[PDB]
Amino acid sequence: LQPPPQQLIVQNKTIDLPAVYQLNGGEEANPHAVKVLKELLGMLISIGEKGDKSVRKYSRQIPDHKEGYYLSVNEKEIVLAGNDERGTYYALQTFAQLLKDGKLPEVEIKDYPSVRYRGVVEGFYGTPWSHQARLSQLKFYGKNKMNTYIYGPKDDPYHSAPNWRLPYPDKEAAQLQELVAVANENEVDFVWAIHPGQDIKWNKEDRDLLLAKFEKMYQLGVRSFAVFFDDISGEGTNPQKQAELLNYIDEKFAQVKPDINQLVMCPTEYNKSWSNPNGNYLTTLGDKLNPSIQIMWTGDRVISDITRDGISWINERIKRPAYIWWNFPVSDYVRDHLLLGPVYGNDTTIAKEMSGFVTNPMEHAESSKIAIYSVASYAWNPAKYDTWQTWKDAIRTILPSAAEELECFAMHNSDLGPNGHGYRREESMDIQPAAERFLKAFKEGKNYDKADFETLQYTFERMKESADILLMNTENKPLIVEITPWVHQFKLTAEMGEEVLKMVEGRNESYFLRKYNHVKALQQQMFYIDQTSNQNPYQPGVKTATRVIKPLIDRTFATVVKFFNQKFNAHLDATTDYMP
Ligand SMILES: CC(=O)N[C@H]1/C(=N/OC(=O)Nc2ccccc2)O[C@H](CO)[C@@H](O)[C@@H]1O
């Protein structure tokens, strides 16, 4: 079960789905919950929210938390009872995972989230997600009990400057409506952010243009709103004025409409390291900002994990629980890397200390679903959060037809490499022991272990199988299109590894020289891809398996060439990263 329920009691009995059933509460329960139930399928099934006639028998079982639910399956009846309408929907999300093979286990579940707001902020620089991608995301949040989507792509001119003031054109507008209607159906809060800080005038006019923009987004059906003040310059940075503006928005707008849910903001100082030692900023905000208004926070740095010391430090100042904006798996400062590793580093005991937890994803929507599924799991029930297990579960969910292959590829595409934000991740941990147990031996003339060589050749053989199976998969075509330049580079990396190992078990000079020449050419092919694919202006190219595997292959090539240049006393160039 993903996310893991707060409480679960499992009997050993399994039951069949009923061919003949009695629906009680169909006309009372959340229609988005009842339409899933009718999708999924006499015997009583009881469905509703606390207060509904149909679940009255059970109100003591339904947890007293928003988005909570009680779910029961046994011989005689099935209970799907939420504390609120969203909790009935969530009961059904859990219910659809229990049901495998037209069969259910006998179970009892009490569930609710540990964090109030959970989801995704599309808040990266680079190509905004396509519309079909966003639709896909929204159903995905639904399924994973994520209830927040903050739409705020830095590169949308109608969200950022200069045209935050201007309403969307008709087509973009109608697409934003559809999205809103899909979010609704999937129990997600579509949160429309605006980013006006860079050119805003603290006058009546601009503050009214901002309200007139919000009003227009309201007419297309938006019910939650955010105001972003990050990465801006000038008079737009004064916290008194931000507070007075957001308070104005809260009182003249959010408090005047019948149904506005979230009102969020992003401070100009949004991580410890970016907060002015000598200044007033964050405590001014915590003092002056209406208590209902959320304040976003990235950690001790732009890129960073959320610790207990870190969350306490910000909470003391903003006088409320920080709303986490977690910059992972975002890659907009390492656009030549894919970050498909597990989600970890965040303290699991601090749920009470945060209002929300959102992930800034990659411009690759589907590749992002690995972290998004994991963040969904972490924020719902952090106490039961299992990094590695959820990661594998994410992969099995995205790509069941080739899960083993995506896991292989994803294991070796996790690290960021050195970067402007100094943030790194584990990579290729499984094969690491063998890697070093080879190269430390090899370097100083010491004979390697059979089992190390074989694990490495195994590794390389498996990378190739994985890459080729992945390129040809039609179950998740959009995922495959995103990752294809890296699947190619990943394969040349494995091929180069095999050929370098053949140089080590190197039979005879001519054979040696053949492999030598094949290596130099495989490397030229990687430069070719690195210089023709993904040619963005920031970090052009395609890097893969960079933390462990490429340096193993590189360092080993230099070494065997070196040993040949002593045995036969030769000219052979010992480098690989020569440059065009
Ligand atoms: C709240 C936040 O993270 N804001 C932006 C953000 N801003 O980062 C910086 O401004 N970094 C930076 C700027 C100048 C000098 C050093 C780092 O970082 C994220 C990941 O790069 C972006 O996706 C976000 O849009």
CSV table of C-alpha atoms and ligand atoms in Angstrom, one decimal, residues 123-125 152 154 195 228 230-231 266-267 270-271 274 296-298 302-303 325-327 330-333 360-361 420-421, ligand 1:
chain,number,residue,atom,x,y,z
A,123,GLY,CA,8.3,25.9,-10.2
A,124,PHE,CA,11.4,25.2,-12.3
A,125,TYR,CA,13.1,27.3,-15.0
A,152,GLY,CA,4.1,28.3,-11.3
A,154,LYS,CA,9.2,30.4,-14.1
A,195,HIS,CA,5.4,36.0,-9.7
A,228,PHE,CA,6.0,34.2,-5.3
A,230,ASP,CA,11.9,34.6,-4.8
A,231,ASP,CA,14.8,35.4,-7.1
A,266,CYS,CA,7.3,32.5,-1.1
A,267,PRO,CA,9.7,34.9,0.8
A,270,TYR,CA,13.6,31.4,1.3
A,271,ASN,CA,16.5,29.4,2.8
A,274,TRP,CA,19.8,33.4,1.8
A,296,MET,CA,7.3,28.6,1.7
A,297,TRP,CA,10.9,27.4,2.6
A,298,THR,CA,13.5,25.3,0.8
A,302,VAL,CA,18.4,26.6,-2.3
A,303,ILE,CA,18.9,22.8,-2.6
A,325,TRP,CA,9.3,23.8,-1.2
A,326,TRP,CA,11.9,20.9,-1.7
A,327,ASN,CA,14.1,21.4,-4.7
A,330,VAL,CA,14.5,19.6,-10.1
A,331,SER,CA,17.5,19.7,-12.5
A,332,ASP,CA,17.4,23.2,-14.0
A,333,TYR,CA,20.8,23.9,-12.8
A,360,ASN,CA,10.0,21.1,-7.5
A,361,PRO,CA,10.2,18.4,-10.3
A,420,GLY,CA,26.6,25.6,-8.7
A,421,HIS,CA,24.4,24.6,-5.8
B,1,LIG,C1,12.0,28.9,-4.3
B,1,LIG,C2,13.0,28.4,-5.4
B,1,LIG,O1,13.6,27.3,-5.3
B,1,LIG,N1,13.2,29.3,-6.4
B,1,LIG,C3,14.0,29.1,-7.6
B,1,LIG,C4,15.5,28.8,-7.4
B,1,LIG,N2,16.4,29.8,-7.4
B,1,LIG,O2,17.7,29.4,-7.2
B,1,LIG,C5,18.6,30.5,-7.3
B,1,LIG,O3,18.3,31.6,-7.5
B,1,LIG,N3,19.9,30.1,-7.2
B,1,LIG,C6,21.0,30.9,-7.2
B,1,LIG,C7,20.9,32.2,-7.7
B,1,LIG,C8,22.0,33.1,-7.6
B,1,LIG,C9,23.1,32.6,-7.0
B,1,LIG,C10,23.2,31.3,-6.5
B,1,LIG,C11,22.1,30.5,-6.6
B,1,LIG,O4,16.0,27.5,-7.3
B,1,LIG,C12,15.3,26.4,-8.0
B,1,LIG,C13,16.2,25.4,-8.5
B,1,LIG,O5,17.3,25.9,-9.3
B,1,LIG,C14,14.4,27.0,-9.1
B,1,LIG,O6,13.8,25.9,-9.8
B,1,LIG,C15,13.3,27.9,-8.4
B,1,LIG,O7,12.4,28.4,-9.5
